[PDB]
Amino acid sequence: SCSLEGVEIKGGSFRLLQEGQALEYVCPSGFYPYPVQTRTCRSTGSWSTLKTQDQKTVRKAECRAIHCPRPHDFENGEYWPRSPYYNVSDEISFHCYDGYTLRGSANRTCQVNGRWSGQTAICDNGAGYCSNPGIPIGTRKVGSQYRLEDSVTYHCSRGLTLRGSQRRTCQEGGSWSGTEPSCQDSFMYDTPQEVAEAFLSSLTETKRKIVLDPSGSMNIYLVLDGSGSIGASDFTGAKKCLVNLIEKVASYGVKPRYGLVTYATYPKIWVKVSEADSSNADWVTKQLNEINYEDHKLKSGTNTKKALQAVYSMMSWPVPPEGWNRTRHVIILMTDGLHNMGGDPITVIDEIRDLLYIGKDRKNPREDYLDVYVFGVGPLVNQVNINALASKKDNEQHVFKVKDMENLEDVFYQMIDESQSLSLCGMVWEHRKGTDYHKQPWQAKISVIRHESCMGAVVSEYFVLTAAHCFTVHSIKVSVGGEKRDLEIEVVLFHPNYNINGKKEAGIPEFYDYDVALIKLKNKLKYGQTIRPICLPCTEGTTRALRLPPTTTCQQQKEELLPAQDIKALFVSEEEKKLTRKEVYIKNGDKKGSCERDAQYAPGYDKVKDISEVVTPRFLCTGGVSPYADPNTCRGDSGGPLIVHKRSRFIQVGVISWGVVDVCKNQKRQKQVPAHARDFHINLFQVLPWLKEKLQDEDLGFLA
Amino acid sequence: DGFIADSDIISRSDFPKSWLWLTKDLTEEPNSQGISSKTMSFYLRDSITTWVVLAVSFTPTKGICVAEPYEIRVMKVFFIDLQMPYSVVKNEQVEIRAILHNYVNEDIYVRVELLYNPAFCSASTKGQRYRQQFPIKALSSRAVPFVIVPLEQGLHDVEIKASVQEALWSDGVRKKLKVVPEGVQKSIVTIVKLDPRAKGVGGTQLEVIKARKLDDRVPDTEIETKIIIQGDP
Amino acid sequence: ALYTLITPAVLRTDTEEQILVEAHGDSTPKQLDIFVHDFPRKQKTLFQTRVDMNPAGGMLVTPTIEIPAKEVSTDSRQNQYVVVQVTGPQVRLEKVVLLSYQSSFLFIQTDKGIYTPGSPVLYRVFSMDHTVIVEFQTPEGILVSSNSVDLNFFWPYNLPDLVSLGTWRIVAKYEHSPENYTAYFDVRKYVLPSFEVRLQPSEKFFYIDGNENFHVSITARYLYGEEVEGVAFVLFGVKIDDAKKSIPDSLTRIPIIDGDGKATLKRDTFRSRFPNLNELVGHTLYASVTVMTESGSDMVVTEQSGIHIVASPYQIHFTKTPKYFKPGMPYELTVYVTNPDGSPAAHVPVVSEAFHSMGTTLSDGTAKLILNIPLNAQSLPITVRTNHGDLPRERQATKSMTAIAYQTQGGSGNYLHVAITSTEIKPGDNLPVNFNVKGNANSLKQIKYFTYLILNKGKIFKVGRQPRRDGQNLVTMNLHITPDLIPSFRFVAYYQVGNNEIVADSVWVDVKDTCMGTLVVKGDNLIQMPGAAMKIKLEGDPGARVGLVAVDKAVYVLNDKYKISQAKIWDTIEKSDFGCTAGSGQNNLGVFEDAGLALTTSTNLNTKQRSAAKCPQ
Amino acid sequence: DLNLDITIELPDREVPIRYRINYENALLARTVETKLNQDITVTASGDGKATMTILTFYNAQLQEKANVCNKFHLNVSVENIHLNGALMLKICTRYLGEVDSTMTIIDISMLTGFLPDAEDLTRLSKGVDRYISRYEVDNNMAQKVAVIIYLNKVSHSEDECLHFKILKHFEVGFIQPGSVKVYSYYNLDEKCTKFYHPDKGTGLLNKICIGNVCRCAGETCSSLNHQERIDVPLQIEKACETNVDYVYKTKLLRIEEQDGNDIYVMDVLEVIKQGTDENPRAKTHQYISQRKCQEALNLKVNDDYLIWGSRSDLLPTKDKISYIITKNTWIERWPHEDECQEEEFQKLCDDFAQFSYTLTEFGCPT
Numbered sequence A: 001s002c003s004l005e006g007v008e009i010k011g012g013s014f015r016l017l018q019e020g021q022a023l024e025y026v027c028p029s030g031f032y033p034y035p036v037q038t039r040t041c042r043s044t045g046s047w048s049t050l051k052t053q054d055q056k057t058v059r060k061a062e063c064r065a066i067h068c069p070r071p072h073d074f075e076n077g078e079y080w081p082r083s084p085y086y087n088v089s090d091e092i093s094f095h096c097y098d099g100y101t102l103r104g105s106a107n108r109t110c111q112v113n114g115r116w117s118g119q120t121a122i123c124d125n126g127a128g129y130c131s132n133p134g135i136p137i138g139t140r141k142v143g144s145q146y147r148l149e150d151s152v153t154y155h156c157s158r159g160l161t162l163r164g165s166q167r168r169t170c171q172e173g174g175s176w177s178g179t180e181p182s183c184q185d186s187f188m189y190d191t192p193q194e195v196a197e198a199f200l201s202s203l204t205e206t207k208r209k210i211v212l213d214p215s216g217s218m219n220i221y222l223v224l225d226g227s228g229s230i231g232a233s234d235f236t237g238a239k240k241c242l243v244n245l246i247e248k249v250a251s252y253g254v255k256p257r258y259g260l261v262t263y264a265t266y267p268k269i270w271v272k273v274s275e276a277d278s279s280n281a282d283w284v285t286k287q288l289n290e291i292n293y294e295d296h297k298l299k300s301g302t303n304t305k306k307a308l309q310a311v312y313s314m315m316s317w318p319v320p321p322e323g324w325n326r327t328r329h330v331i332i333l334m335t336d337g338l339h340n341m342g343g344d345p346i347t348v349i350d351e352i353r354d355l356l357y358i359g360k361d362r363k364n365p366r367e368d369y370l371d372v373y374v375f376g377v378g379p380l381v382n383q384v385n386i387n388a389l390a391s392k393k394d395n396e397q398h399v400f401k402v403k404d405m406e407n408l409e410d411v412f413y414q415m416i417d418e419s420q421s422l423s424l425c426g427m428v429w430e431h432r433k434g435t436d437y438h439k440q441p442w443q444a445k446i447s448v449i450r451h452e453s454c455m456g457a458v459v460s461e462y463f464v465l466t467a468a469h470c471f472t473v474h475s476i477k478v479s480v481g482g483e484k485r486d487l488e489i490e491v492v493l494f495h496p497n498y499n500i501n502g503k504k505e506a507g508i509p510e511f512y513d514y515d516v517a518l519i520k521l522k523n524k525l526k527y528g529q530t531i532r533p534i535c536l537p538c539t540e541g542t543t544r545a546l547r548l549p550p551t552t553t554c555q556q557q558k559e560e561l562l563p564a565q566d567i568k569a570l571f572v573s574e575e576e577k578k579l580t581r582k583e584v585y586i587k588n589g590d591k592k593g594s595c596e597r598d599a600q601y602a603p604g605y606d607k608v609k610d611i612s613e614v615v616t617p618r619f620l621c622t623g624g625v626s627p628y629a630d631p632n633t634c635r636g637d638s639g640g641p642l643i644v645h646k647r648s649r650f651i652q653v654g655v656i657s658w659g660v661v662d663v664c665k666n667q668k669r670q671k672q673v674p675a676h677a678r679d680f681h682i683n684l685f686q687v688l689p690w691l692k693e694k695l696q697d698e699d700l701g702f703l704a
Numbered sequence B: 001d002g003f004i005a006d007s008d009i010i011s012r013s014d015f016p017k018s019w020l021w022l023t024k025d026l027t028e029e030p031n032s033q034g035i036s037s038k039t040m041s042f043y044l045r046d047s048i049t050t051w052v053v054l055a056v057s058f059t060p061t062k063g064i065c066v067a068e069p070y071e072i073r074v075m076k077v078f079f080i081d082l083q084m085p086y087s088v089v090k091n092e093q094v095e096i097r098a099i100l101h102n103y104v105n106e107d108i109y110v111r112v113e114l115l116y117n118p119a120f121c122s123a124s125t126k127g128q129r130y131r132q133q134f135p136i137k138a139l140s141s142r143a144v145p146f147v148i149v150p151l152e153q154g155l156h157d158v159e160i161k162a163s164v165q166e167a168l169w170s171d172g173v174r175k176k177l178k179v180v181p182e183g184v185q186k187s188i189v190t191i192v193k194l195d196p197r198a199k200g201v202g203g204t205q206l207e208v209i210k211a212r213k214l215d216d217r218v219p220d221t222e223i224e225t226k227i228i229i230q231g232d233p
Numbered sequence C: 001a002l003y004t005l006i007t008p009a010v011l012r013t014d015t016e017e018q019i020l021v022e023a024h025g026d027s028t029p030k031q032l033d034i035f036v037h038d039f040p041r042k043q044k045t046l047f048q049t050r051v052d053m054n055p056a057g058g059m060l061v062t063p064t065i066e067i068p069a070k071e072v073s074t075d076s077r078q079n080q081y082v083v084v085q086v087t088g089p090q091v092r093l094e095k096v097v098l099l100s101y102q103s104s105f106l107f108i109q110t111d112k113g114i115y116t117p118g119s120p121v122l123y124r125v126f127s128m129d130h131t132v133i134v135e136f137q138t139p140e141g142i143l144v145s146s147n148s149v150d151l152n153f154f155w156p157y158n159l160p161d162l163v164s165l166g167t168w169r170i171v172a173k174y175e176h177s178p179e180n181y182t183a184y185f186d187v188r189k190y191v192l193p194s195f196e197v198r199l200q201p202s203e204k205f206f207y208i209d210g211n212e213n214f215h216v217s218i219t220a221r222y223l224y225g226e227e228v229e230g231v232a233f234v235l236f237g238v239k240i241d242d243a244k245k246s247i248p249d250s251l252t253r254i255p256i257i258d259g260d261g262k263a264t265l266k267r268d269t270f271r272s273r274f275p276n277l278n279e280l281v282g283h284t285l286y287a288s289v290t291v292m293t294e295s296g297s298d299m300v301v302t303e304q305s306g307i308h309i310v311a312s313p314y315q316i317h318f319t320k321t322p323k324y325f326k327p328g329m330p331y332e333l334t335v336y337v338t339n340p341d342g343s344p345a346a347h348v349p350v351v352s353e354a355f356h357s358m359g360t361t362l363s364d365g366t367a368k369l370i371l372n373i374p375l376n377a378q379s380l381p382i383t384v385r386t387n388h389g390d391l392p393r394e395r396q397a398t399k400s401m402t403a404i405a406y407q408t409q410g411g412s413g414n415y416l417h418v419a420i421t422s423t424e425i426k427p428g429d430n431l432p433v434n435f436n437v438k439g440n441a442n443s444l445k446q447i448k449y450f451t452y453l454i455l456n457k458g459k460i461f462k463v464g465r466q467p468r469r470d471g472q473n474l475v476t477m478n479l480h481i482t483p484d485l486i487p488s489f490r491f492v493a494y495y496q497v498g499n500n501e502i503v504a505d506s507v508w509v510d511v512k513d514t515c516m517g518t519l520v521v522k523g524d525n526l527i528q529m530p531g532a533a534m535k536i537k538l539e540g541d542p543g544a545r546v547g548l549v550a551v552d553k554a555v556y557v558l559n560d561k562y563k564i565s566q567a568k569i570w571d572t573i574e575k576s577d578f579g580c581t582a583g584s585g586q587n588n589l590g591v592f593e594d595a596g597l598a599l600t601t602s603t604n605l606n607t608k609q610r611s612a613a614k615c616p617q
Numbered sequence D: 001d002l003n004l005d006i007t008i009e010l011p012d013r014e015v016p017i018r019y020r021i022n023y024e025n026a027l028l029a030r031t032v033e034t035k036l037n038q039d040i041t042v043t044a045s046g047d048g049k050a051t052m053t054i055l056t057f058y059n060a061q062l063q064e065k066a067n068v069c070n071k072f073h074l075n076v077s078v079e080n081i082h083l084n085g086a087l088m089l090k091i092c093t094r095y096l097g098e099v100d101s102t103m104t105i106i107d108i109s110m111l112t113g114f115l116p117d118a119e120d121l122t123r124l125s126k127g128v129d130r131y132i133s134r135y136e137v138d139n140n141m142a143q144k145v146a147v148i149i150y151l152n153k154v155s156h157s158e159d160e161c162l163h164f165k166i167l168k169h170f171e172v173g174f175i176q177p178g179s180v181k182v183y184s185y186y187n188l189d190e191k192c193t194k195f196y197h198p199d200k201g202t203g204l205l206n207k208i209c210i211g212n213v214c215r216c217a218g219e220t221c222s223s224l225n226h227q228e229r230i231d232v233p234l235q236i237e238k239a240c241e242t243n244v245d246y247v248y249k250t251k252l253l254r255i256e257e258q259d260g261n262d263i264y265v266m267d268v269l270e271v272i273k274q275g276t277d278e279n280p281r282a283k284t285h286q287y288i289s290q291r292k293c294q295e296a297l298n299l300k301v302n303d304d305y306l307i308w309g310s311r312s313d314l315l316p317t318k319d320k321i322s323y324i325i326t327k328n329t330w331i332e333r334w335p336h337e338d339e340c341q342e343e344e345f346q347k348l349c350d351d352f353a354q355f356s357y358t359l360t361e362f363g364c365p366t
């Protein structure tokens, strides 16, 4: 075992993994653990050097700011501004020389994950046989002639790895061979939303459908890696992923011949395509549910070559069969790219390619008939290796790397959700068209004429949840989905315990206890890409959304959503007709005592003696500068949902009520705000009798 | 140890011979003397040199007008100057002479690394950069030779980095070195006279020019064929 | 009873061309029709209009005609003419006029003057007015690109990786026009050196038969400002046409210290190599400097060329005075003095010893000398020599010319002389003009007005009338000089006598060449870190379209010969002028012909045809 | 009148190229670029005439002259000297022309951390026939790393030798070769260049060359690993790093010698870890080092070895698996069987077995 001293981390935190054989760190957002995300145990009593990418010693582990890569070269134009590096949310613009037309994204913003928004900007004279391949921001491009059969090479700034084609050739078709390259840090990752979209977008064409040839067939080979490096936990977690992949695919109508292989020192086959059954998704799903990590524990090496040769066995033939050059092949590989026996896995692909007659004719590519996808488990992935295996297809992405095995499940879990039933609570599919409201469908603007502008969440087809203090005493209207149209409401349901004057007797003006209200609309709502419900605490919809069994209790949900710690949450604020997700932390742990105590600094409470008077067990608490500096709500955000974003879904846990300091100008920033400026939210878990009641006839299905 | 950490040194690479090929319009309100003034912002490239900005305006009543050049002088206090030849031959050992320019009025102690590149054989390797440390008198230049052997054909980056001890003065340069293959470029010339009419009214000439014989050719180098057609006057 | 038509001797496409219609001895309001037909077959009506000529406008109209190129395209060469006709009550005039397809002056700008194989050549085309063909030629003269371009968007040319090395041409022309503007650019496998080398000669010339030595001062600077330190090699020679003959024994090695060096050519070493002076006439002396940095890291090769080997420091030219005088009147002699390369030479005194007339040259290298011609002479020998206080009489330049007398119509002895005192004329200047008449008493009383033309850039620009109150031997008129008259303009003026005789004269005037408008790039002028934010101010005329470019001084120092300049522009205009001489003419018809004008009269006095649009050399 | 149609078919594409040439565009030359030396089929329908020039550009071998000093002979040597590091630099040169060569230049770069002996250099500059740009002095050393000497001439008959001492200013790890260039005013192009180094003949960086493919051979020599005990747990880790392709036990058959290179011919006895080479035991494995490294290695014929290397170091030798010995290559002596008896080797052979087994049986840990 190893001693946990000196393992701190500026403006951040950490949590032990693998019983303690390899720890790991957790930063806010737009921050990355420097220099390494995880260490590995040394049998000396000290965990490890504080090295880096390179091999030099650091003395105080910190959470650095995520940086977007600076353009090394941009051809045929200028870009504004030029900085050593780019900060989160920074904007960079591209302008073209005279005679050149800009294709791609003229303006680009730096995103919270170190990737630039939009697509690669290119200044093109339209003279090349092909377009100007461009220079993806972060790479360097050699070769400037784009005639027929010319090539260009890419490489990345040392300390980064290349993803995509390192070389691309101009083809007869007019397109470039391979796929657009990009530069990857050790700390960069793919959000599950990106992987979900990217994968299906490649695997299929568009309600999507899988494209088979007339009277054709598809073979899907699932190759899982079970070497010691993977680990036990991270293994059965990948087994789950493959389960959901089986469902998702089957739901595209076509019955594919499957193949199942786990590997290590040796490959074990669990299903061969040659068999008459294959096709049964229940058969395969059952075989899959069988596999245990202890199947390789003995001989636990990483001989990926042998594993792919297994797949080369299932493809071969006696004479050539009937319908061979009509069958689409698709490999799903789940390794960490750390092969250490057998040699270069690539030599097997090039073996398969020649077996399927792929890339052996200038009149026929047959490139469509083979796809190799590679999913990288998490940190300690060799991106050079999982990339050289994945297919390189123009305008499609075949190689993926995600933060942890948790997030990888999130991918396949979100696929079965595109899958349908827009009535599905807290479900937002990341279409690249941004378009605001598409990203927060549940948001409801409110105006009560007198004027006042609160917020709310859409819980059912009839009901909108908001704060009770927005009302007192036709006079009121609701607007949703960026719809100018404001909707007729039938009646407001105040919580029976609510009373803004509850303690006007003790010289304490506004008493915000039980500050929740429901608004039943006069007209049912029809969901859509910009109007959906949000999950409520203690529903079957939530239990399902969280990936739990039907035998999950109400307390178990709370213990899962609102644990006794610092909870990562988010609310929705309107800043000039645009909706943005502000990320805050619910102080529910050791910091919870001091968060509430800031209540007597809030206006009106100058006479308050014991804060238990105005802070009740119904309130949650956010804001302040511990652990991190949290954004604050506004009067205009009051009533809005306080959301928790777990397992790729959005569950509302609270209702925005009151604040200790009016930090809004309007505008907001200030830019800096008092440390005592907290925000209090009504904890929906504390108002369940009233919720279950009024929302009984609504399809939400509660529990206790 | 006293020196600036490598990762903190960003090498200069953007050395265009010409840029800012843009057109702007003088739309602003004229002043008392009928002159429209337009402010314009932009960022400089990496070159340590003097840029010369040339304007040329045209209006419908005042014809073409060429402005007197505005010069921009770009310079660091401490920097590397690297002169490359137009090309070097593959496999053939050459010397590259860099120059450390100290324009600080004091003596400095510097460190100079050559970065490792797989395209070259040199003193540097994947694990150990080739490092020199030495003093420079106040205002001196100093030459720093680097011996290298190009191993691949094409354009390849030579990157040199320098830093002054106990101070914030650093510079890096990354220039491209053109590497051509061994031998001499020759060319075969085939001529064909196109005269379809020479074969009757409905005239076709069909000419099959087969693969040209060229067996002096160094194996594994690029071949390029140009088919040109001129018309008869 | 006398009707006159006067038009530019050459009409341009496709732009506005003013013409002149006049009614003398008449005052009855008319209605003239102006037809422009092709020639000869008059197959169509290229332009047409109706005009009102009345006593209010002094019986004199200035219509604007315009000949579209769509309508007279015929890929002929040998060429094309058109015919102008004026018809009205009692007025039947017509002139066959030569046609030019150069709608206006085009100029080409390329980003750099020197290129590497496999890079883009960026370019723009400019027009003086407001279609065009742009062509690229290899150094072997092969056409490799031909495009019809829009005047505000051009396609960059891309040199192949296997390009042909040498000097390339970009050609811009209007279709059908044998006239073209031509830019050059070199394609070399070449690395731009890290420093500039500037050369400064001791003297602007070299005495073919002198005793003095010749020095070439050298300056070397790194392109970022500071001084180069190294060594220079200088080798002198004599350039005979383009065949260089070197003076081997002159090769000198020279230290560059603090950027400065000084190389010498001994008159001794020169005499030894070129003893026979005959072999040296009209040739130039050159110097080929070669500088190396002290580290052996870099090398620059420049050259000092075009140092003429001469007998005198100056040349005298009569290219700016009339070759025709008017007996009994003060003749205006304009001496032009230049250095051996052709540049103007100021503060040089000149003399014509036959007339004992003196004068020193001004900033434009000219001196106006008034001579009084005897009342009788017909031929007139003028000799002029320089008289610089720093030269021995033997080193003075000299030149001679012969001016003939202006022939009067019918031998009337009726003359007209236009004179202008002012010099170094800039826009903004107000200019006194002088109409002087001499001749028959019975005639000088009929003169009731002077007609004048202001010709500029091949076009009639303004026309006017100057009254003459009877008795007035001398009539002065003011004339504002506006930016329209750059680079130069012609003043043509005539009067009529008894509706039969035409007496005329013309003057050529020079204007200080600049821009018609303004353009200035302004900055703070401080030293800059690489990759810094910059702000520059563009100052110019309202509605200006400004094309920008930033060039490394590594180039831009190279091939100065190829760069576009305000000066190169005006010299193209001037070489394209349709007027061929400095003023006056052999006679009345000769004054128009020479000023680039055409005239036809109702008396059938006709300026002869034009055998081509370029003036004889 | 002139009106010609052209079709150009090339095996590199399907769609052929069509051209139309007539009076209005006959001055214009039409060009087609291909990257292949394949058949070309041209047709021409129509009226006019045309000349088609087909230019093929390739790289041709030259008569085995390379850099060859064409205009000068140049000899540069360097030798150690007693001076109670420091060396003597001798440079001999002669113009190969018909007459003595006007204004000649001898460009010199110093070995790393070396500078010219001040006194010796000051003595060189003295002369009516010479020039050396100004140099500063400290600790009796000329503060110039690049030293140019400009001579007024150089003989074409007798050689002209010059020499000076060079002294070690700063002491660094590796000593880069220095170089000497020679050229003259009328000959500023094909600059004659020789390198020099105390440890090297031709002053050349170490490289190995099969044909026209060269790899960097390293400056330090690679030597036989020698532990007298094997930490099997850790020895295992080392052979299971991601850039180790294979792990063989081998026997050394022969030592052949080509162009100053040593070819150690190995037979593979056991595949301890399978590498890319799918069938290694059936072929002879050539491991290549340069001869100047015979003794640092110290391989003996008919001994056994534990060799494990990296795929990267595979050489382009036809019909023969060849590797370059690198710092990325591990070689250790494997005691014979009849040696394991002798107590000197006992427990070493056990760790050897416990190694070959743990790997061939279980494979790597991760």
Ligand SMILES: *[C@@H]1O[C@H](CO)[C@@H](O[C@@H]2O[C@H](CO)[C@@H](O)[C@H](O)[C@H]2NC(C)=O)[C@H](O)[C@H]1NC(C)=O
Pocket: A083, A085, A086, A087, A090
């Ligand atoms: C992002 O923030 C950092 C500050 O930590 C900016 O860093 C610039 O460069 C250094 C490092 O702090 C400072 O000397 C400058 O003051 C910073 N910017 C300025 C004002 O020049 C970095 O520039 C920021 N990202 C941007 C704006 O590109």
Ligand SMILES: *[C@@H]1O[C@H](CO)[C@@H](O)[C@H](O)[C@H]1NC(C)=O
Pocket: A093, A106, A107
């Ligand atoms: C890019 O940004 C600028 C202002 O930041 C804007 O003027 C321009 O229109 C933008 N271009 C787009 C939206 O593509």
Ligand SMILES: *[C@@H]1O[C@H](CO)[C@@H](O)[C@H](O)[C@H]1NC(C)=O
Pocket: C135, C171, C178, C179, C180
């Ligand atoms: C341009 O004009 C001159 C006339 O002699 C000559 O260089 C050439 O004929 C012209 N160039 C063309 C027509 O492209």
Ligand SMILES: *[C@@H]1O[C@H](CO)[C@@H](O)[C@H](O)[C@H]1NC(C)=O
Pocket: D073, D074, D075, D076, D077, D092
């Ligand atoms: C240089 O070459 C000459 C032959 O011209 C020879 O005598 C001498 O030994 C050589 N010196 C060396 C090998 O440095």
Ligand SMILES: [Mg+2]
Pocket: A227, A228, A229, A230, A301, A302, A338, D366
């Ligand atoms: Mg593993």
Ligand SMILES: [Mg+2]
Pocket: C486, C487, C488, C510, C511, C512, C513
């Ligand atoms: Mg002028």
